[PDB]
Structures are given as structure tokens and as C-alpha cells.
A paper describes a structure:
Each protomer of TRPC5 can bind one Gαi3 protein; therefore, a maximum of four Gαi3 subunits can be occupied in a tetrameric TRPC5. Remarkably, the Gαi3 proteins bound to the ankyrin repeat edge of the channel, which was ~50 Å below the inner borderline of the lipid nanodiscs, and the solvent-accessible contact surface between TRPC5 and Gαi3 was approximately 690 Å2. We observed that three TRPC5 residues (Ile57, Tyr58, and Tyr59; hereafter the IYY motif) appeared to contribute significantly to the binding. Even after extensive 3D classifications and particle sorting according to the numbers of bound Gαi3 proteins, the four molecules of Gαi3 from the fully occupied TRPC5-Gαi3 complex (hereafter, TRPC5Class1-Gαi3) showed lower local resolution. In contrast, we observed substantial structural changes in the cytosolic domains, including the CCD and the ARD, when TRPC5Class2-Gαi3 was superimposed with TRPC5Class1-Gαi3. First, when viewed at the bottom of the channel, the CCD was rotated by 45° in a counterclockwise direction in TRPC5Class1-Gαi3.
Like many other TRP channels, TRPC5 is permeable to Ca2+, with little selectivity among monovalent cations, and functions as a thermosensing channel. Here, we present structures of the human TRPC5-Gαi3 protein complexes using cryo-electron microscopy (cryo-EM) and demonstrate that Gαi3 can directly activate TRPC5, increasing its sensitivity to phosphatidylinositol 4,5-bisphosphate (PIP2) using electrophysiology. Remarkably, Gαi3 binds to the ankyrin repeat edge of TRPC5 ~ 50 Å away from the cell membrane. Electrophysiological analysis shows that Gαi3 increases the sensitivity of TRPC5 to phosphatidylinositol 4,5-bisphosphate (PIP2), thereby rendering TRPC5 more easily opened in the cell membrane, where the concentration of PIP2 is physiologically regulated.
Numbering used by the authors:
A (entry chain D): 517 to 645
B (entry chain A), C (entry chain C): 16 to 273, 286 to 665, 705 to 753
D (entry chain D): 195 to 273, 286 to 323
E (entry chain D): 710 to 753
Amino acid sequence: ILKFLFIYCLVLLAFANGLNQLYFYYETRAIDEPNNCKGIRCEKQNNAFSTLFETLQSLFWSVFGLLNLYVTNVKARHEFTEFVGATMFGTYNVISLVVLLNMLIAMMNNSYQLIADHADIEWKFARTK
Amino acid sequence: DRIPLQIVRAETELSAEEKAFLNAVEKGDYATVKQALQEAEIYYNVNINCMDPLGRSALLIAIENENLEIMELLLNHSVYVGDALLYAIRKEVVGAVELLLSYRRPSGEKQVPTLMMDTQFSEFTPDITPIMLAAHTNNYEIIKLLVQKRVTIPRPHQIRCNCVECVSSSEVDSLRHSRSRLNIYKALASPSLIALSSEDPILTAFRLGWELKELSKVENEFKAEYEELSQQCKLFAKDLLDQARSSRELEIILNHRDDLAKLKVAIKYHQKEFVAQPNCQQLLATLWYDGFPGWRRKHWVVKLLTCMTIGFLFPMLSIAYLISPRSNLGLFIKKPFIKFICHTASYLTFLFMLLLASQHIVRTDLHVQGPPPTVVEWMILPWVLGFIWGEIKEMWDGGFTEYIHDWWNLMDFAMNSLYLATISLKIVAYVKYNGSRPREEWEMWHPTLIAEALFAISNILSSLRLISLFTANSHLGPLQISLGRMLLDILKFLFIYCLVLLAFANGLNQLYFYYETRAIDEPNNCKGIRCEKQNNAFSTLFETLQSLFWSVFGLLNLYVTNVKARHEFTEFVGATMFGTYNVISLVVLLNMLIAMMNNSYQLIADHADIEWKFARTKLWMSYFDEGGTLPPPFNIIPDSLIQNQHYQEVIRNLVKRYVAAMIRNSKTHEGLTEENFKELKQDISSF
Amino acid sequence: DRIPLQIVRAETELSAEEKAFLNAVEKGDYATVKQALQEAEIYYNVNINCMDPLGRSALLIAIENENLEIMELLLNHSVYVGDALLYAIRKEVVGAVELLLSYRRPSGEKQVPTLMMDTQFSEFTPDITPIMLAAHTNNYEIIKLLVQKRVTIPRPHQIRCNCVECVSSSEVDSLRHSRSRLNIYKALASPSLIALSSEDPILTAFRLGWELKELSKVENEFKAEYEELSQQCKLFAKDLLDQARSSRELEIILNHRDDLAKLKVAIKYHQKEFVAQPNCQQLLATLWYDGFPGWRRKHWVVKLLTCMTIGFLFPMLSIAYLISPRSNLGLFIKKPFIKFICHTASYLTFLFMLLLASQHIVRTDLHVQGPPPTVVEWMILPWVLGFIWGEIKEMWDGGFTEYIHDWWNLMDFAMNSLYLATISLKIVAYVKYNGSRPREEWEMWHPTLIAEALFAISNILSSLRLISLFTANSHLGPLQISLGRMLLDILKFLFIYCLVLLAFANGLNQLYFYYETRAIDEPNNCKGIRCEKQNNAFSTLFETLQSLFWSVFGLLNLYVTNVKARHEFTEFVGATMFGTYNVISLVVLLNMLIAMMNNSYQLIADHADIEWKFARTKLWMSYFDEGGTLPPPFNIIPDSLIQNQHYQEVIRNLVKRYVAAMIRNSKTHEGLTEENFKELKQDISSF
Amino acid sequence: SRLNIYKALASPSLIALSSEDPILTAFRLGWELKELSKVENEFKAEYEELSQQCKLFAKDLLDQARSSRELEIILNHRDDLAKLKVAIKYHQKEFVAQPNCQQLLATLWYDGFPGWR
Amino acid sequence: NQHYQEVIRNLVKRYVAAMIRNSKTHEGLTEENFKELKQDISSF
Ligand SMILES: CC(C)CCC[C@@H](C)[C@H]1CC[C@H]2[C@@H]3CC=C4C[C@@H](OC(=O)CCC(=O)O)CC[C@]4(C)[C@H]3CC[C@]12C
Ligand SMILES: CC(C)CCC[C@@H](C)[C@H]1CC[C@H]2[C@@H]3CC=C4C[C@@H](OC(=O)CCC(=O)O)CC[C@]4(C)[C@H]3CC[C@]12C
Ligand SMILES: [Ca+2]
Ligand SMILES: [Ca+2]
Ligand SMILES: [Zn+2]
Ligand SMILES: [Zn+2]
């Protein structure tokens, strides 16, 4: 798992940098937004790619599906920028949920198959210790 | 009910005298055969060339029983000698093959006795010459004896051959042509024939391995045999390299030319076993850590701190090479490890500055139409030009036929195209979009927005370029090799997934685009799946494709299949379509992809060490040359006969060591038992 | 720097005369030994019991070289004969063991010659008697020869033994006790000793297999050896059954008593290989399809239609058994297949009526506090009472110690408890809740609502009871066997998952329950995660457990970690806790569970045929008896010596066939080669 | 030369003949060969095979015991269970998980509760 | 130390016996038998 999260952290940093670089012009204040809140932890999901920390949080939470789709929508009608941001978000989702997670599944299943033969000796060694 | 059993294909039954003669031959009695041969000459009782039903002849049975005196008497009395040499060669006995080779010319008088109908059965195909079968059996002594008698093998043609004789032979009889080519390549790929009849066994093994791999790619039917022959050639080259005993022999082998020329040839021919041999890896490690002796013995703290300071000294030690290449400080950059660390530090600095360009400290006054570049972008532009010049230099040096085989140069080309695009869009927006119009009323297709979008995509590609540095580490190399194989499996899967997605998107759009609504009628003046309330999702083909893509991750809600009017049947049919697509793409296809990459990971995990070492060698030798010494921020700032004699002297010892290492590992239980039984029988008979 | 190599444990070096004597012994010369033995008697030059450093003696070397005349001369001249019988037995030669057995009593005069310090080395432990080692080697002739001479083996005690001698021997020397018990059980589990010294080899094999499995469960250290011995006993029983040649022998074996008594014994001892043997399966299939000959040869359409009509004739043919058991129609229910189909049809009718009870056609006037039962429920009540009476009858017959081992009776007990609970709640709500109060103002703890909830849970259990019918089919049997094993793996996983869930729920509740709000302040007067707007999710331990359970399936939103005030640090820490729990429970633990059940499926897929056949046999023999003929809607409506002689006659032929089938498959390449070499050497020496 | 020397020193017969403490010698050579396998990248398989050979030699030499007194003499020998602590320190998993050592450790663990199994 | 060396003597000698008897294989026994047969035939 640690060997996998090295690559996942690299990919997450890359896509968070790309999304934040595209999107932080459209940051809004908490007063203009409803309920005086700003972030992805609101009832209506506010600006999610306005800071590097907020982009990292949003791209982390998007793996479990708790990040909605309308976070890639801006106030003005910049359809090309919205489409490019949605393409970036979709590519990150495809990687982190179709490639990387299934590779992690295959990796730990292979390692479980190698470790299941010697599962008796090391358990007895740990119990003796 | 009594199924009748009868010999439906009845051979001619042997005569009683013939049965007695071959029974005497297989008995091994020397005295009884001679009276039979004299009476067959005089009285013509026994045809000497008779044939028992299980495919054997008296000479041929004497070959199997390896008795030489019965051989000599029979062949003195003129048995048909043809096709018997192949059985002796397959028997792998020196005495029989020497006896039939020696007595091919017994001062033959009146040509040969006539024969009719006895060249019916031969276990070997007519294209098999004795040298080819000797190479197939891979026995050193028989091959040497045959080669000493001036024998030849036909040369196979090119794979892409269109001459008259190859086309005519393939058209008339394709099976004979394929068998002949496979037999010729089996004869040429034997280690003994390469060790005996080629002056450069390593280069010959490399070329035959590459040719057999290409034939395996072309010829679909004999793929397994050609792959086995290529593997045999590769392991022969690896063993011949492995028989070395000193570093001087290893560096004579590797540096031999027609610096490391033979290693470059081996990499060009994809010889992974030759490259990943431990002594070659040790020599490459000693060349890689040129200025840092004992790098493996250091504690990781001082290794890490040395890397820390030599990475942080990246603006220095590169201008020193510019101002004084011959100084003690100037020569310290020419070593490959310092080159690699300086390039890595330069790329990390580039990524850090692209990270810093996305902050509010630098970015000011966003409400200008065409903005002048900020001080961060003015400083960035030399690294972009350095990457451009480095990729241009890599495109000229080495050739266009080698620049495209790396498969990382496509990513660099996309990076360069995006950087040129964003530079061009910024300069055109500077020169002819003067103004300060606020961003809320800009054109969708404003070139500033296109420039920023392409800049963001180039940022992602630049930050994802760091995958290629994983072979330098000892833990992330085989991991990305498995990534590379399973990515091909992913592409094979997305072919089927794209077909299914296109089918269901067409079906949903065909059902649903009547109920498209305008953006004015819908709340918040928005139209699409990227709204707070998910609007019409199946109203255009592009929108249907987007919705069916986003439905895999669960970000598409269920009420997108609901229309304004109360058409319950149409809504139910659309929901059924959406449910069927979800069942396929989330229960069938994804789990099949899981099983596919897990199976491929299980096959690739056995060889995860050799290909990682091959990739690490290919990365190491990229820094050995002097072309590309400077980092990207600074690269734009303005006798052969003696070597042949030594190589042949080394190859003599290596080949002789390898042939000794084969014979002693070739004597097995069965052959030793057969030799002991034959010796015991001979001693008992003589006594 | 010259590591000194020296013999640090130096044996006493042999004398030159001793070296000559043992060299003459290993040479095999008969003449040279005799003068040495006479001179050792007269001149006392050679100690006959001397010991070369590699653990051998002159008699013992003569044992390894299997020469009998040197044996006879040495043992005539009084070599120490002890411990040599074990080496002869391990040599597996009849002549040597017969010679040492015969000359144990050479009319011994003046006891034995004295010996000091030569019982130092024995390759065999002192607890090994010759019969035990003969059983260990598993050779028929040596075992027979030893048994013919009145030999005994000690009886092992019970596993749960607490007598004085077992406790004292375990306390003083546990290793010797464990080795002795393992050696005794290895001697008793050999097929030859069971075939020779037990009058009921099948029952003895069953009992020893069960005892060895129980010892493997108890003794942790020798689990592999005891499991191997149990497997050896099971395969011996399977082979002895497999050596049958006729149906009369098979039905004599299966029906032998101390109807199918031995099959019931085999099922009780969990002999899966004995039960799933093909001829026993054929006999059970012929008994199962008693009234339908040629059921396997029919096309599936007529088989399906026959099942269709005999399932639809379920109310008939059961009352016919009540009114006329001796009629032609009355006897047709006693066959097992018709019993199984009628029980399945009754259960399907019960499930269909529970489905029909949930419709608006029957249910009327929901606004009564205590409703009288409707006509559907009045009709249902006899099936519930029939299930009760059937489970009561199954609890008495067979015993309480067998009713709990099925593991399906827990589900039936839960079903029965729920049915009694809902019946009691309905009758109490009838008798003392008279009224017509509307449902919107009922008490939370109203017994009518509790009755309906328990009725729904009983409905789910009744409909999920259909899993147990999967062994009757040929495709769903091994599938649910794999389900059964992987469910145990699931329980092993949910132990760790429950621990992690409890930890993170405690952490979140400890952080968050200050900010609990009342239901009045929150919108729609609701409080919990089951609202339209997700309310406080970490305000109680139960609510935190529910929220962290529902977060695995993604049904818990992200804004549950937001509080009313602007405590950004507390919100961030809670979001970090929630994210860490999500990472664990969805990236680590679930994928580990995937890998675990995939690995267990790979191990269980090899044996998926035997255990399915065992489960199908256990289901088939449940319908063979006459107890439980009627369906649940109708079950409440008011000489031994001749058999022993035949069994022993069959066992004689079976055991003799099995021992012949072992010796011919016991002659191997190595033994035949050794015998041929010994015969050739003997013939050459004699000539 | 180094690989040949370590192959010569790791043979069971030479340890049994030329070392007065075969168990401790097997432990130390196994640890040294494992450390050499960690350091030397090229001969990792050979050094790991030699370390495994030393570990199984120590396990077999322990397994050739015949009585509890011999086992407790072996385990409690010093230069209480000193040799078991040494084996754990050298990561000898096959030596520790041998069944008779596990039985002795189980009897020491259930000191006041006889017949716990 | 004396008791330990006394135990190691028996353990090492048992282990070396357990190797030689499991070291005699089919091929070595066949080679020895063939050599003995050839020597006996030549001597006779
Ligand atoms: C974990 C998160 C914060 C992302 C980090 C991204 C980068 C800062 C990492 C990812 C890949 C790393 C590289 C992976 C492997 C190596 C090889 C490593 O050298 C060796 O392994 C020694 C042997 C040799 O290569 O000769 C030196 C560090 C370096 C360049 C690493 C430098 C730091 C990199 C670029
Ligand atoms: C697919 C959906 C609609 C759920 C259906 C549930 C039931 C109607 C099914 C599930 C399990 C089925 C049973 C599975 C296996 C069998 C055995 C089958 O008989 C055989 O396989 C012949 C050999 C033999 O058992 O002797 C007869 C039908 C039956 C009872 C099936 C009857 C129909 C059942 C109860
Ligand atoms: Ca490049
Ligand atoms: Ca029951
Ligand atoms: Zn041609
Ligand atoms: Zn007792």
C-alpha cells in the first residue's frame, strides 16, 4: 500500500496543481456565497479548486464519490474553461478509480498468494516474541 | 454384437528366411549373418534390403543396437546405405557416424545394385541433410566431424522476399517451404554450430535472435517454435558472457567494435538477458558512480545528504563547465551520476516554479484583456526554450528513426506543442487585445483563456513526466514495468468499453432528444449535467456521452431520466437502458478488467527483475555521452586489428569453457547407463 | 588470514587391523573374514563390535550390502545382535529379517559377551520396536513375518487423559512422550497393518482417521503429520471400497451392521472420499430415483414437465397417504424424489402466499389498533404450526446432540421464535387494544408495529431459507460450498473491521458530541442521518456507529462534519478523521478481503466436487427414512451371523485384491535395478 | 573469490566438522550472508540461498534432538533461554518455530495451568 | 560447556548419519554397482 501511495501522491499533486492553476481566478468570498461558508464541507458545494489545499482536499474526496460534479461550474459562462476543467477531473477520476485502485488490488492479491505459503512460521515467531 | 477386428492396411508379410535373417541381426550373432549374406549372393535367398513392418532395416537395426562389426559386414555386402546416416546421427554415437562417413567410397564398382520400392519409409523429411540433423541434436563431436568434411547449409532468404523462386515454391508447396525454413533456422540456432562455424558468436547469436523474433512476429503458425529458438539464442549469448573470469576479459568483450559498443548493440537487439547479467551490471555501476567510490557501503544518511547538497548546487557547477571545462570543478559535472542529479534538480526546480506561478503573491490585476507576462513567466521562459532546444538536439542526433522508439518523446512533443501554443496566444493577446475589460463579459473563445487552459494541461504533463525517473530507484522500477504492461491491458479493455458506451449513448439519445429544453426555461440559466439541479442529460450525443461517462463514478443522479410530461413508458424504458448500461459497465466489464490485469501481473511478476535492469541500463547509458552535459536552463547559453586479435583470443577461451560446461552437464543417467551396459556386454562377449 | 580448520570433535581413530577387517567386510570376500574372526578369538586382535566413524558396524554393513553368508559367519562368531533388526527392516529385504529373527536363539551359552561403550549410536529412537518400524515402512511381507511371531504394539491413551502415568511422563519428558505417541499412531495407521490385524478394516480406518483428526485439532505442533495420517487412512478406506467388482459386494459392504448403516457411519465420521466414490453415488442415485427408472436418459423437457405436474399435485397425494397408505396412489409418496419435490412445492407455496399477503387486495382498514387476522393469515397459520411441529419432531428424534450440528437449525429456530413472537403480539393486540385510532398517532412501541416488523424479518428468513436446496442441482452446489468457506473468511475480516469501526466511532463521538442540537431547532423536526438534509451524525455513539457504517456505501454526505459555529480547526480534524476511516475501510480492508476470498477460492476450487457430493448425499439420506413423509401443511393432521459371515467373505477378497494392487504398484525402477544388480553379482560370483 | 569463500564456509559438513558451536556459527553466517545479500545487489540470489541453507542446517541440527533434557541444554546454553534470545536477535524463524521449541515455550507459558489444551 | 559439547557430539553425528543415508541416490548406487560388476568381471 505504501509503494502504491507514492505513485498516487505524485498523480494527486500533478492534477491538483493543474486544476488550481486553471481555476483560482474564480475564487469567491464567503459573504457572497450562501450560508457564509466556503469549501467542499457545505450543503451546497462551494469553490473546490480555488486554493492548492482546497484542490488537494477535493481531489482526495473525489475518490470516494463525496465530491459532486457542479464544483467545476463557474459563475460566468466560460464554457471552454468549464469543459477543460471537467476533462481534467474526469481524467483524474479515470486514473485513480480504474487504473490505480485495480493495480493495487492485483498487487496485494499477488503478494497475499506469495505470503500465504509461509503464514505459519512468521506467526509462530511473532507469538514467541 | 461382435465388432469385426481385422488388419485393414496389411503390409506384405515377411518371408521365413527374411525373418530368420533380421532375428539373427537383432540377436547380435556375428557368425550367423555371414553365411546368410554369402547364400543371398549365391542362392539369392534373402533380399538384404528387406523391411520389417515396424519401420526398420538390418543395417538400421544394427545402428540401433550400435554394433559395428555387423555394420561393417553388411555394408561390405552392399546394403542400401542411403538415409542411414540420419539414424546414426540421431543415435548420437561417434563410431557409427564415423563408420558410415568413412565407407561412403569403397571403390564402388558397377554403380549401385538396383532397388525398387524400398525408399518408401524414412522417418526424416527429405529436406533434412546430415549437418542440419546434427545441429538439431546439438552434439559437439558429430557436428565437428561433419564440418571437418566440407559440408554446407542453404542460406534462408529475407522474411520480406518477393523473388520468383520463393514465390513459386510457396505457391506450389507451402508446407514443404515452411518446414524447410523452420529446419534451416533450427540448424542455425544451435549453440554448437554458432560456437564452431562463426567467428563472432555473440554478434551471430544477437542477429539470429532478432531474426527469429521477427519471423515469430510475421509467421503466425510457428510462433512458439521461433520464440523458443530466439530464447535459446539469447540464453546461449548470456551463458557465453557468463563464462568470463576477469574484468579485463569483460571489458574486452563489451568494448569490442566491428565506448561500450557491444552493449549498445545488445540494447539495440533487445537482449535483456545479456544486459542484466551481474558482471555487466557491476561494470555499469562502477562507470555510473565514477567519482563516488564505495557508494553502496555508505549509510543512507550520508548518501541522502550528499544528494541533498549536490541537488541544491544546481545553478553552480554548470556555469563552471561554461567558464572552465578543464578545471577540477569543471570536470566534476561530466560524471553520469552528477549529470543525473543535476537534471533531476533542474526538473524539480521547474516544477516548484510552476507551483509558485499559481499563487496570489505574483498574480495581480486579473481584469486586463491582454496581460504582459509576469516576472515568474519571464523567468520561466528560458527553461521552456531549453527544453525546446534539448528536444531539437535529441531529434537530430541519433536520427529520426530512433527518436520515435523511446515512447516518452510523444509526451515531450505534446508538452512542446502546448508551450508554443500558449506562448503564441499570450503574444497575440498582448499585441492586439489592448484593454481592461472585466472577465465576467469575455468571449468564450478568448485566446487568453485558451492560453491558460493549455498552460494548465502542459503543467499536468510536466508534473506527470516524473514517472520516467522511477527506474533509478530499486523499488519503483518493476512497479512501473507492471504499470506499462497493465496499461496495454487497459487499452485492450477500453476498446470494448468505448464500443459499449457508443452503443448505449446512441440508444439513449435516439430515445430522448425530443424533450430537449432551452436554458432560459430551466433554473439558473444553465443546461447540462454540470449544474446544481441535473438538467437534460440525454438531449445531444455529446451530452449523452458525457452523462454515460460520468455515470460510472456515480456522479450522475437518477432523476436525469425524468421528463416534464407524464410519459411513464418512455421514462421506464430510458431507466431500463440506463440500468442495463450500469450493470454492464460496473458489474461485468470492470471486474473483467480486474481479473485481466491481475492475471497479467501474475505472469509479469516472475520476470520483473530483468526488464527493470534493462530499463535502468538504458537510462544509465543516456548520461554516459557528452551530448547533453548542461541542464535545460543552461544548454542554450552560447588499431582495429589489435582489438580483433584480443577479442578472438578471449572468444577462444570463452567458447572452449562453454563447450566443456555443456559436455559435463550433458552426461546424464540414461546415457551413462547405456554406455555402461554396452561396455559390460562388449567385455563379456570378448572374454 | 588463514582461518584454522581442524577436527574439533575427534572420534577415536580406527586401528589398522580394524580398518582391514571392515574393508574386507565391505569388499564382500567371504574367505578373508573367517581367519580374522578366528584370530580375534584366539589372539584378540580385532574387536568384532568396532565402529567406523560414519555410523556403521560389520554386521550392519553386511546388512546394507545384503550378503547373508557374511551375516551368518559374523553372528556365529557372536556379534552384538541388538538394534540390527531395525536396519534390516528399513532395508526391506526378507532374507535378512528372516535370518536375524531365526537366529535370535542359537542355544546361547554363558549369557552374552560383555560390552562397554558401543551402544552409543543408534539411528532409531529407543521407543521403536521392530513391528512399529515395519508398519512405518509399509511392507506386507515383513509385517506378516513379524505378526506371525506373536508381537504387540502398546495402546495409546485417550487424548483427554488425566491419569497419573500419562501426566508424569508428560511432565518428566514431554518430547519422548510426543514422539512415542506419534510413532504409535504412525504404526497403527499403515494400510498393511489394518489389512492384516483388524477384522473390520473399513471401520478401523474410519475410527483411526477420526482419532487422528481430533489429535491434529488438539496437538498444535504435529498438525501436519496427524493430518497426513488421517488422509492416508481415508484414502485407504476409499481404495478398499474401490476394489469392489459387483453390486452385490457393494450392497453387502454398505448395508453391513455391527438400511445403509455403514454409509451413515461414514457420514458421521466425515469420510468424504468414501461417500463420494462413484459406485456408492450410483447406488444412491438408483435408490433416490426409486419410481422413475432411466431419469438420466430423458430429455430435459419431459423431466421438467414431470417435475411441473408433480409439484402442482402437492395438495393431492398427501391426503391420499392419510386415507390409504397401502394403495397404489398412497405408496407413491414414500419414494425420496417425490418427497423432495413435494416439500419443495410446499415451501414454494408458502413463499408465494407470503408474497400474496403483501398486496392491497386482501389488506383492508389499516386504521384499527388491534386487527383480527385476515383470511390469508388464517390460512397461513397451519403452515406455521406445521413447521413448528416438524422442528419439534426433528429435535426429539436423532437427539439434541445431532440437531445442533446441522447449522441450518439456527435459522429455523430464529424463524420459529419470530413466528411465535408475532403470533403472541397479534393475539395480545386483539384482546386488549380494542379501538380504531389512526396510525399517525400510535405509540412507537405499539405491539402491532413490533409484530409486523418481526413478521417482515421472518419473511426474509423464510425466503432466504431456499439456499439449502442448491445441493440438489449440479451447478449450484460447489458454488454454495465456496460461499460457505468464503463466509468464514468474511467473519475473520469483520472482526478487524468491527474493531476499526469502534475505534473511529469513539474518536469522532468524543470530538463531536458537544454540538448536538435538538430536533425542534433543526428543519422538518428530524434528527439523524435518515433525513433529507443530513443532520448531526456524530452526536451519539449509536449515531456515530450508524454514520460510519453508512459511509462505506457512500450514502453519508460530506457536510455532516460541519458545525454551526466557525470552529475551523475542529471541523478540519473531524474531516481528517473521517477521511482516514474512509481510506482504511475502502482502500485497505475491502481490497484485503477481495484478495483473501480469491486466495481461498483458488484453494477450494480443486476439491469442489467431493464436498458437494457429500452434501448432496447428506440431503438425499434425509428423505430415505419414513419420519417426515407428510408435507408441513399435513404433518399435524391426526440373522446377524449370516451378515457377518458374508461381510468377512467380501472383506477377504477386497483386502487380498488391495494388497495385490499395492505390491505390483510397489515394484519401482530403483528396486528392480537393485534386485537385478544383486542377482547378476550373485550369478557371476557363483559361476 | 568472496562468493566462493562464503559458499565454502556455509556448507553444513564444514560447520559440523570445524566449528565447536555449529548452531551459533550457523546463526552468524546466516546473518552475515543476509547482510551481504542486502549490500551486494548482483549476487542477491546466491547469498539468499546460502543464508537459507545455513538456517535449514541449524533447524535440522535442532530437530535431531531426542529428549527434553537435550532440548533444554541446547536452548539454555550461554557463551534463561539465552540461545533462543540469540536466535530471535538473528531472525532465525525456522529455528524458533520448530515444534519442540514451541512445546517447551508453551509449557513455560502455561506455568500454573497444566493441561490447558 | 561440557554438557553442551556432549549434546552437540550426538546431534552432529546423528545429522551426518541422516545425510549420508539420504545422500545415496539411484544414480550413485547404479554407478557403484556398475563399477563393482566391471571390476569383478575383469578380475575373474
Ligand atoms: C511524495 C510526493 C511528495 C511526491 C514527490 C515527487 C518527487 C519530489 C519525487 C517522485 C520521484 C522521486 C525520484 C525517484 C527516484 C530517485 C532516484 C534516487 O536515487 C537512487 O535510487 C540511487 C541509485 C541510482 O539511481 O543511481 C534519487 C532520488 C530520485 C531522483 C527521486 C527524487 C524525488 C522524486 C522526483
Ligand atoms: C430466479 C428467481 C426468480 C428466484 C427463483 C427462486 C426459486 C423459485 C428457485 C431457487 C432455487 C430453485 C431450486 C434449485 C434446485 C432444484 C433442484 C432441481 O432438481 C435437480 O437438480 C435434479 C436432480 C435431483 O435433485 O435429484 C429441481 C428444481 C429445484 C428444487 C429448484 C426449484 C426452484 C428454486 C427453489
Ligand atoms: Ca526526450
Ligand atoms: Ca430443520
Ligand atoms: Zn527469395
Ligand atoms: Zn493415561
